[PDB]
Amino acid sequence: RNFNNLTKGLCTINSWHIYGKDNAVRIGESSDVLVTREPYVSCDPDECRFYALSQGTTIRGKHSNGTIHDRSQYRALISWPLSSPPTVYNSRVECIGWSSTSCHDGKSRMSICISGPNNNASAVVWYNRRPVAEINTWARNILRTQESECVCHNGVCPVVFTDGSATGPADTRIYYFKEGKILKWESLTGTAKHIEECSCYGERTGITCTCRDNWQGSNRPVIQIDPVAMTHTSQYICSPVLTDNPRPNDPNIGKCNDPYPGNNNNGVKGFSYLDGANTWLGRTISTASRSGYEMLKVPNALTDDRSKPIQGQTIVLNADWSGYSGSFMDYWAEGDCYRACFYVELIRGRPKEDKVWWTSNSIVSMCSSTEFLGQWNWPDGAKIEYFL
Amino acid sequence: RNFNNLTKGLCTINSWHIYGKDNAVRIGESSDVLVTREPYVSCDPDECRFYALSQGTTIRGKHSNGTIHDRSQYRALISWPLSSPPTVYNSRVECIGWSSTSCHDGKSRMSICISGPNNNASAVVWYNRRPVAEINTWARNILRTQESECVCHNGVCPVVFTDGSATGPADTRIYYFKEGKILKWESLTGTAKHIEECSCYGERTGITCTCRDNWQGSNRPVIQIDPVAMTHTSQYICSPVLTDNPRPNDPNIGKCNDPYPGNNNNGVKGFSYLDGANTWLGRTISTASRSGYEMLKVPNALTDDRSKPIQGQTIVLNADWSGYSGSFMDYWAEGDCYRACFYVELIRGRPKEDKVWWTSNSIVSMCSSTEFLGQWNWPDGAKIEYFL
Amino acid sequence: RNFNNLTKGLCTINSWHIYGKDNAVRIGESSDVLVTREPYVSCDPDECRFYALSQGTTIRGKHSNGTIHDRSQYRALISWPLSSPPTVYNSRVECIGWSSTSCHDGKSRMSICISGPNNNASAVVWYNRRPVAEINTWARNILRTQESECVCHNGVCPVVFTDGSATGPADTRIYYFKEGKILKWESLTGTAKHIEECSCYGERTGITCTCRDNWQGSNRPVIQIDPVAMTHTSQYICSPVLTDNPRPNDPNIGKCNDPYPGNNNNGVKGFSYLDGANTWLGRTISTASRSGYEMLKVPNALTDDRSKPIQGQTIVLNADWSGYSGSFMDYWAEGDCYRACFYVELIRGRPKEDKVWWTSNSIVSMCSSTEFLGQWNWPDGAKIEYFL
Amino acid sequence: RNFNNLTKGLCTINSWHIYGKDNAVRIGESSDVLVTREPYVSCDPDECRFYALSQGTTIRGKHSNGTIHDRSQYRALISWPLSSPPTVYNSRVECIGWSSTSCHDGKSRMSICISGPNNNASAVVWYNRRPVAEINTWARNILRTQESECVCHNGVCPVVFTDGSATGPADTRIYYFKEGKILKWESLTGTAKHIEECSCYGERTGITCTCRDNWQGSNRPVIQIDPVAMTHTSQYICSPVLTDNPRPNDPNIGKCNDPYPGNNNNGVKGFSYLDGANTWLGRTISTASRSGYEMLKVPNALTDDRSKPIQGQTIVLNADWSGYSGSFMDYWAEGDCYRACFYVELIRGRPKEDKVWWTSNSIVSMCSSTEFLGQWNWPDGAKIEYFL
Ligand SMILES: *[C@@H]1O[C@H](CO)[C@@H](O[C@@H]2O[C@H](CO)[C@@H](O[C@@H]3O[C@H](CO[C@H]4O[C@H](CO[C@H]5O[C@H](CO)[C@@H](O)[C@H](O)[C@@H]5O)[C@@H](O)[C@H](O[C@H]5O[C@H](CO)[C@@H](O)[C@H](O)[C@@H]5O)[C@@H]4O)[C@@H](O)[C@H](O[C@H]4O[C@H](CO)[C@@H](O)[C@H](O)[C@@H]4O[C@H]4O[C@H](CO)[C@@H](O)[C@H](O)[C@@H]4O[C@H]4O[C@H](CO)[C@@H](O)[C@H](O)[C@@H]4O)[C@@H]3O)[C@H](O)[C@H]2NC(C)=O)[C@H](O)[C@H]1NC(C)=O
Ligand SMILES: *[C@@H]1O[C@H](CO)[C@@H](O[C@@H]2O[C@H](CO)[C@@H](O[C@@H]3O[C@H](CO[C@H]4O[C@H](CO[C@H]5O[C@H](CO)[C@@H](O)[C@H](O)[C@@H]5O)[C@@H](O)[C@H](O[C@H]5O[C@H](CO)[C@@H](O)[C@H](O)[C@@H]5O)[C@@H]4O)[C@@H](O)[C@H](O[C@H]4O[C@H](CO)[C@@H](O)[C@H](O)[C@@H]4O[C@H]4O[C@H](CO)[C@@H](O)[C@H](O)[C@@H]4O[C@H]4O[C@H](CO)[C@@H](O)[C@H](O)[C@@H]4O)[C@@H]3O)[C@H](O)[C@H]2NC(C)=O)[C@H](O)[C@H]1NC(C)=O
Ligand SMILES: *[C@@H]1O[C@H](CO)[C@@H](O[C@@H]2O[C@H](CO)[C@@H](O[C@@H]3O[C@H](CO[C@H]4O[C@H](CO[C@H]5O[C@H](CO)[C@@H](O)[C@H](O)[C@@H]5O)[C@@H](O)[C@H](O[C@H]5O[C@H](CO)[C@@H](O)[C@H](O)[C@@H]5O)[C@@H]4O)[C@@H](O)[C@H](O[C@H]4O[C@H](CO)[C@@H](O)[C@H](O)[C@@H]4O[C@H]4O[C@H](CO)[C@@H](O)[C@H](O)[C@@H]4O[C@H]4O[C@H](CO)[C@@H](O)[C@H](O)[C@@H]4O)[C@@H]3O)[C@H](O)[C@H]2NC(C)=O)[C@H](O)[C@H]1NC(C)=O
Ligand SMILES: *[C@@H]1O[C@H](CO)[C@@H](O[C@@H]2O[C@H](CO)[C@@H](O[C@@H]3O[C@H](CO[C@H]4O[C@H](CO[C@H]5O[C@H](CO)[C@@H](O)[C@H](O)[C@@H]5O)[C@@H](O)[C@H](O[C@H]5O[C@H](CO)[C@@H](O)[C@H](O)[C@@H]5O)[C@@H]4O)[C@@H](O)[C@H](O[C@H]4O[C@H](CO)[C@@H](O)[C@H](O)[C@@H]4O[C@H]4O[C@H](CO)[C@@H](O)[C@H](O)[C@@H]4O[C@H]4O[C@H](CO)[C@@H](O)[C@H](O)[C@@H]4O)[C@@H]3O)[C@H](O)[C@H]2NC(C)=O)[C@H](O)[C@H]1NC(C)=O
Ligand SMILES: CCC(CC)[C@H](NC(C)=O)[C@@H]1[C@H](O)[C@@H](C(=O)O)C[C@H]1NC(=N)N
Ligand SMILES: CCC(CC)[C@H](NC(C)=O)[C@@H]1[C@H](O)[C@@H](C(=O)O)C[C@H]1NC(=N)N
Ligand SMILES: CCC(CC)[C@H](NC(C)=O)[C@@H]1[C@H](O)[C@@H](C(=O)O)C[C@H]1NC(=N)N
Ligand SMILES: [Ca+2]
Ligand SMILES: [Ca+2]
Ligand SMILES: [Ca+2]
Ligand SMILES: [Ca+2]
């Protein structure tokens, strides 16, 4: 009934506990489960749900052949109950397209989907399940957005978009929406040199987004947004604990205002929680491919170019495939602090497992604990040979 | 809680954006998706849904054999969540029959289904999910109706029916319903010479229906209805931009008060938005068969027999199958204008793809934008060979 | 919020219109549809639903083998949305057992299921989805009940039970429930000599039940119940238009107070609407087996032993299988009269179609019209050979 | 809106009536039914539901191979509508883990799931569908809990946990939760020597839990909890009617304060209702394996070491497989007493039926009657050979 305001700080993060897991590939071996990728999680005031980009076919369906493809007319943003798999019969379509974001402002949910050919893409902004505003491509090269949830404050929901080359200078914009309408947009400023797929969270200080430099960087760009003034700045995570993938080995001095070099023209969506001594970074374990996942406690990672881990937790073993990761929080939970959460996309199939002709994923998700909890590891769990 | 009144004009239409798409044939290759045809879209005050005539079998089911047939005892009007496919487990049956219309009046939804043999058909009018009134055939020859949504004003919901020959003079009536009860009916008046499958929308000026002349015309008949006086007139779209299918090539002078000749005893359900300089017409790209779909901006198409396009947008490539098309709007959306919307039925199977024994469809739907958005094309997307 | 009172008379019945049809066997050929039998329909104040006794297996499931059996531990009363099929995923279990009745009193629904071996069966009475009262067998021989909906007045819902031989004298009781609790029960009185499977409806005059004499009669016993005094009487339909199955040919004088002879130890559940000149009887067309179905207007059938039809309507052709039939009405519909409704069970499989090893059914349902509507015929529609 | 208080005594138990049964294995032979084990039942103020630990695969799915395993990353506590089977499309995930409990306090539901490796397991406590508190392992040996519902009084919901050896002395704790937060915990006191899988119910006197001694006992330990003082005591059921499995034959003197010897390092979850002369015990019929199930009326079983049965009821024949059993009640039912209920897990597959590679179950559930009802028997009902 009222817009949510970001009035709390992050809860102290001493470990991570299991929040959700859908086992979608395991179940989809023998159930009508939609092929997906680019999943995330987002909360309403009364419910938290899984989100992803469907490929408009089930995994066992013959149309799963070719689903490594990123952008087709058969994709849509869908949502479904927490820890259920995305099935044909329980998935709610939020909008049509092949790149998305979504968030609830306390009153209603805004969802954004982009569709179109590479040179003529357009975003449609939905609010309370109705289309409200539209944004045409500005650089005519795959207009695209976060692939995880946005964050709102007093009705204002900033969203990061990029249009242009994925392997060079591009045109990144921050849009400020309210009830789906465009209040304002800004071109990217600050020292981040390339921006993709921002993972955002909000707290009393403002909104923090950790992104993917797909051009020259293996450190992650950060965009900090003031949703009241509707302004932002950008830089990189200063820490030498590098968190993109693929990536070089960790040095002892990171880079605050420029890409850390070694790997070009690639990356993976990821996230971090940047909160002084309460700072935690997520990354794939492997420096070469999207396998494994760990959280590392790196004090002042955002600002300290010497910072190293003082604690950690394995989420997925290096022997198991991971993928995209991003942040979300239940802004409507009771208590005096916001509990940090994240999900990890567990990609199965192509390109790495090419005995099948499809690409899909399942989801695992965690939230922070003030306890120091024992760790497990959370594989997708499907046997690829069952699909042969 | 109150009846909706048509108090707004159309939003300015500068392009079209994707609204919904269910990918039903793709998904139905390996899911329990009902065989359908004659789909449409209609909104409640709190939700918009897909509608269609089920054939009472799934596509993979052996009973899909023979579903080219138009009128069986196994058909029903079903509705299901926007952009989901019509599955056995998520489809709500509105009423039983093989021709239908449906609309919400602001308080409750009226649904009409016609069933029966060709010489003894009858309509049942449902209101708030209960049968309220019934109408017996008057010409004993396939009593039939719109196959898209009706429109209401202050509780009054006009509906166009036809009974009689589909290839000659027939008996068309306009009925005026309120809470499912018959207030009044009228025989067709005006210059339209044959009427089928009217696609309607409402705005402050009244209700506008674009129909199908299945007898001698390839221009589309139009019926204009005053839901307050409960009266109507009819003519044809004057424009030489002809919009039926099949159809002759576009001349330079159209016909306002008589069928444009060249093609007899056939047609396709279609629609238009007739709003002065803000006028847009939909049509198949092919003049020979139901393939492709485009929208054309044709100023004053209704009244100007010389009018030509000044802008357009491709919806479906000519290389891809289309089918029926019709209008709907979310009359309960916020703002100062009604946003024009439409759907296109994408028919797959027989008669054109006869290596399968079934006929079904999927749906694509668009709404207008005040932006000038880039265009894509929206194929059904199923590979027919997967069903062999 | 208040108990419903029976304050209206029946609407004038001039013909019948299609109300619902689920096509369950057609769809179940390739969908997870539960095997059922003994279906019915019953309304809540906000919704009308299909009901039936599941067999605890789908039709395609290997456990469908043997489902001709009447009483197993795997049966349950289920309900599901009007005109949907009874699927594993959309069916709500009301209670466990192999004989049932159910009705809404205006505030909440009472459901009764009987389970047990032949000599030790017991009824459990559920109210507002909780078990409230239980009734043990009194004759130790298949305690059993209506297999269609009961009817309530000011909270009082009478139900007819039988315990004892199905082919001789048995012990029939009328129970009077309120909020699931037993107010009173009575032994059968009047001239009906054997009672099974009563089909009931209520109006201002009281509650009328048409039953099945499975012993010596081919005319139908009738029980008339005053839900205020909680008393009843019984007789037979006097009309020589005989309505059981199997049955002798129609004579010219029927029997008011004794079974009409010719066929012993068999019958079928059926119904009638007994309302003076507005009287309609349902029956199978065949006198030999459960095939075909027709409604006949037989003025004063209840009291006139000479009464013959003056109008009729075919529901199912004799060439198509029928089965059980029963009455229900939407007591919560608006207007000044109760609209008579009925369903027909369309049995497929064993014993008549024994190339399959299962027995199931679909449902067709009609309601009365004050119009004189054209008639169609409504087959189950499944091709049995598809299941081989 | 208010916390439930335990203000009533147990209803007099004179027999048991069928409450629910899902036939999950029968249906899962040809439907997307999840593999489960460790099921239970629990009520909300407006609904009662089935619960179980999913294995993250369907029965027909190839991933059902190996589901005898107790603790994997693919398990989750799910709930689903009463007497429906646990399907992919109707099951709601409550939390992730391989051991669980859940209960409603009158306002909202608390659910607890434990996950992790054997030496590093942790419990997450959810309240109103959000994670609220976490508890780390204290003995580093399979932290584990009830596998049936907990019970609340004025917001306080006690839960019994065990950590440590399953075949020797272990560390059992009673936790006291309110709105998911830990008010207090206590180490086990009293004469019970080993505690597993407590089955609890509440009434005005307090909360009673019947557990499983997996070490040296074949009599069942009992924990009695005062949810106001938040204190407890423990002992064994004194009766010589022994109720664990496997177990020795019944002696004539039981043991109140020590394990009854004969069988070591095994057991089965079970329950009892301990209420003076109104006392009923459940047990498997076989003393050797988990087959059959019966209820026995054993007056003062808790305190009388000579007590023997004076009445009984067979639930499952010895010829049929049973498994875990536990207590629940609808604390929100109307009336002056709490109606005792229980469920029995009917395990199918491995280890006893090893021609299949999976292990799953279905559920049967009963509630008490004040009538003396006839008894039936309730097998799972699936034919194992259909799965070959
Ligand atoms: C039950 O569950 C519990 C809870 O989960 C389990 O306990 C957990 O165990 C895990 C696994 O060991 C721990 O995670 C690691 O944490 C360490 C950080 O803690 C260590 O270091 C701290 C900092 O020390 C520095 O400062 C202090 C200041 O005093 C100074 O004294 C010290 O000398 C040093 O200068 C210490 O404070 C800390 O000690 C404390 O905690 C101890 C317990 O851990 C305890 O015993 C002590 O008493 C004290 O209380 C401790 O020593 C992380 O460093 C580590 O992450 C690195 O290693 C993993 C591989 O295991 C790797 O994947 C990570 O990426 C990372 O290493 C890479 O990056 C580094 C940084 O750039 C680089 O330096 C490395 O060379 C390495 O780089 C290579 O790999 C990466 C990745 O592939 C690649 O990108 C690079 O290019 C390169 O190739 C782990 O996260 C948990 O913290 C711990 N949790 C708790 C609460 O205890 C418990 O084990 C379970 N029980 C059982 C029986 O299983
Ligand atoms: C990214 O996306 C954007 C947005 O979608 C893309 O931009 C769009 O591009 C499409 C495709 O070109 C455009 O659609 C066409 O629009 C034209 C109408 O616009 C043209 O004509 C206007 C009218 O000109 C007249 O009046 C002016 C008054 O000043 C006068 O000056 C002029 O000389 C003439 O007298 C012009 O105003 C307009 O110019 C403006 O816009 C230009 C951009 O388009 C711009 O460059 C200019 O500067 C200016 O601003 C422009 O010239 C439609 O005519 C056309 O539809 C016809 O053609 C298609 C085939 O492509 C056909 O399917 C249609 O049915 C139709 O042609 C049939 O019907 C005609 C009418 O009867 C008939 O005459 C034809 O012979 C033909 O008939 C045959 O086929 C039919 C169908 O099968 C059959 O039934 C007949 O029997 C017969 O066989 C298109 O709709 C969009 O308007 C445009 N949108 C925007 C906002 O720009 C962009 O391309 C994308 N980018 C990339 C890189 O892909
Ligand atoms: C479009 O749809 C419309 C609407 O549905 C269709 O119109 C409908 O058509 C059907 C089919 O014909 C009609 O159903 C039949 O109705 C008759 C009753 O109506 C007839 O009889 C009335 C009574 O006459 C008596 O009294 C009058 C008083 O004046 C007196 O004048 C007369 O001489 C006689 O004494 C007449 O009033 C009535 O006339 C009126 O209506 C006419 C239209 O029908 C109209 O033309 C007239 O102008 C006038 O207005 C009319 O003559 C039922 O008798 C009949 O049911 C019997 O026959 C069917 C087989 O068709 C059978 O299945 C039934 O069970 C029943 O016959 C069995 O039972 C009898 C009673 O015991 C027995 O006597 C029979 O021998 C027979 O018994 C055998 O079979 C049974 C069953 O298997 C077995 O159990 C026995 O043992 C034995 O073996 C039909 O129900 C509709 O009424 C009619 N509706 C309307 C509104 O018009 C229209 O056709 C469709 N259009 C097209 C093109 O298809
Ligand atoms: C329709 O449905 C109805 C309702 O369900 C059916 O009626 C039911 O029928 C069942 C089956 O018979 C009954 O269950 C049994 O109940 C008896 C208890 O009742 C008997 O004993 C009572 C106590 O007598 C003692 O005190 C009295 C005090 O006066 C004294 O007089 C007497 O001499 C003695 O000292 C009697 O009061 C009672 O009589 C009353 O009820 C009679 C009807 O039952 C009636 O005829 C009388 O007039 C009177 O009114 C009656 O005699 C339980 O003992 C029994 O449970 C034992 O047996 C079963 C096997 O059947 C077994 O599975 C149980 O575990 C148990 O036996 C084991 O444990 C014992 C205790 O340790 C042990 O002693 C045994 O040796 C045995 O141990 C072995 O097996 C176990 C298990 O595998 C193993 O662990 C051990 O190690 C060892 O190997 C049954 O539960 C119902 O009570 C009854 N219900 C009602 C309301 O009547 C009706 O039959 C159905 N109709 C039809 C046609 O089918
Ligand atoms: C070309 C730009 C890419 C991001 C830097 C690309 N984004 C889009 C909209 O295509 C992603 C990338 O190619 C894939 C990934 O690296 O796994 C997913 C893919 N993302 C989506 N398909 N939504
Ligand atoms: C004979 C009259 C026809 C319309 C002019 C016909 N309508 C009905 C009720 O049968 C349509 C037409 O035959 C088919 C179409 O052209 O695709 C669909 C078909 N419409 C439906 N099956 N609902
Ligand atoms: C033996 C008594 C019979 C009724 C007269 C019998 N009723 C029960 C409870 O078994 C019915 C009868 O045998 C079958 C019918 O005639 O189709 C159904 C069957 N009814 C049900 N299975 N519910
Ligand atoms: Ca990079
Ligand atoms: Ca035409
Ligand atoms: Ca009979
Ligand atoms: Ca034991």
Coordinates of N, CA, C and O in Angstrom, one line a residue, chain A residues 348-380:
Chain A
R348 N 23.7 -26.3 -17.5 CA 24.0 -27.7 -18.0 C 23.8 -27.7 -19.5 O 23.1 -26.9 -20.0
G349 N 24.5 -28.6 -20.1 CA 24.4 -28.7 -21.6 C 25.5 -27.9 -22.3 O 26.6 -27.9 -21.8
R350 N 25.1 -27.4 -23.4 CA 26.1 -26.7 -24.3 C 26.5 -25.3 -23.8 O 25.7 -24.7 -23.1
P351 N 27.8 -24.9 -24.0 CA 28.8 -25.6 -24.9 C 29.6 -26.7 -24.2 O 30.2 -27.5 -24.9
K352 N 29.7 -26.7 -22.9 CA 30.6 -27.6 -22.2 C 30.2 -29.1 -22.2 O 31.1 -30.0 -22.2
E353 N 28.9 -29.3 -22.2 CA 28.4 -30.7 -22.3 C 27.7 -31.0 -23.6 O 26.5 -30.9 -23.6
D354 N 28.4 -31.2 -24.6 CA 27.9 -31.2 -26.0 C 27.3 -32.5 -26.5 O 27.0 -32.6 -27.7
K355 N 27.2 -33.5 -25.7 CA 26.5 -34.8 -26.1 C 25.0 -34.6 -26.1 O 24.3 -35.3 -26.7
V356 N 24.5 -33.5 -25.5 CA 23.2 -33.1 -25.7 C 23.1 -31.8 -26.6 O 24.2 -31.1 -26.7
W357 N 22.0 -31.5 -27.1 CA 21.9 -30.4 -28.1 C 21.3 -29.2 -27.5 O 21.1 -28.2 -28.1
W358 N 21.0 -29.2 -26.2 CA 20.4 -28.1 -25.5 C 21.3 -27.4 -24.5 O 22.4 -27.9 -24.2
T359 N 20.9 -26.3 -24.0 CA 21.5 -25.5 -22.9 C 20.4 -25.1 -21.9 O 19.4 -24.4 -22.4
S360 N 20.5 -25.5 -20.7 CA 19.5 -25.0 -19.7 C 20.3 -24.8 -18.4 O 21.5 -24.8 -18.3
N361 N 19.5 -24.7 -17.3 CA 20.1 -24.5 -16.0 C 19.2 -24.9 -14.9 O 18.0 -25.0 -15.1
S362 N 19.7 -25.0 -13.6 CA 18.9 -25.0 -12.5 C 19.4 -23.8 -11.6 O 20.3 -23.1 -12.0
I363 N 18.8 -23.7 -10.4 CA 19.1 -22.5 -9.6 C 19.5 -23.0 -8.2 O 18.8 -23.9 -7.7
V364 N 20.5 -22.5 -7.6 CA 20.7 -22.6 -6.1 C 20.7 -21.1 -5.6 O 21.2 -20.2 -6.3
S365 N 20.2 -20.9 -4.4 CA 20.2 -19.6 -3.8 C 20.5 -19.7 -2.3 O 20.1 -20.6 -1.6
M366 N 21.2 -18.7 -1.8 CA 21.6 -18.6 -0.4 C 21.3 -17.2 0.2 O 21.2 -16.2 -0.5
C367 N 21.2 -17.1 1.5 CA 21.0 -15.9 2.3 C 22.0 -15.9 3.4 O 22.5 -16.9 3.9
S368 N 22.4 -14.7 3.9 CA 23.4 -14.6 5.0 C 22.8 -15.0 6.3 O 21.6 -14.9 6.6
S369 N 23.7 -15.5 7.2 CA 23.4 -15.8 8.6 C 24.4 -15.1 9.5 O 25.5 -14.8 9.1
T370 N 23.9 -14.7 10.7 CA 24.8 -14.1 11.7 C 25.5 -15.2 12.5 O 26.4 -14.9 13.2
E371 N 25.1 -16.4 12.3 CA 25.8 -17.6 12.8 C 27.0 -18.0 11.9 O 27.0 -17.5 10.8
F372 N 27.9 -18.8 12.4 CA 29.0 -19.3 11.6 C 28.6 -20.7 11.2 O 29.0 -21.7 11.9
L373 N 27.8 -20.9 10.1 CA 27.3 -22.2 9.8 C 28.2 -23.1 9.0 O 29.1 -22.6 8.3
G374 N 28.1 -24.4 9.2 CA 28.8 -25.4 8.4 C 28.5 -25.2 6.9 O 27.4 -24.9 6.6
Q375 N 29.5 -25.5 6.1 CA 29.2 -25.4 4.6 C 29.0 -26.8 4.0 O 29.5 -27.8 4.4
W376 N 28.2 -26.8 2.9 CA 28.0 -27.9 2.1 C 28.4 -27.4 0.7 O 28.8 -26.3 0.5
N377 N 28.1 -28.3 -0.3 CA 28.2 -27.8 -1.7 C 27.0 -28.2 -2.5 O 26.3 -29.2 -2.1
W378 N 26.6 -27.4 -3.4 CA 25.2 -27.6 -4.1 C 25.3 -27.7 -5.6 O 25.1 -26.7 -6.3
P379 N 25.5 -28.9 -6.1 CA 25.6 -29.2 -7.5 C 24.2 -29.2 -8.1 O 23.2 -29.3 -7.4
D380 N 24.1 -29.0 -9.4 CA 22.8 -29.1 -10.2 C 22.2 -30.4 -9.9 O 21.0 -30.5 -9.5

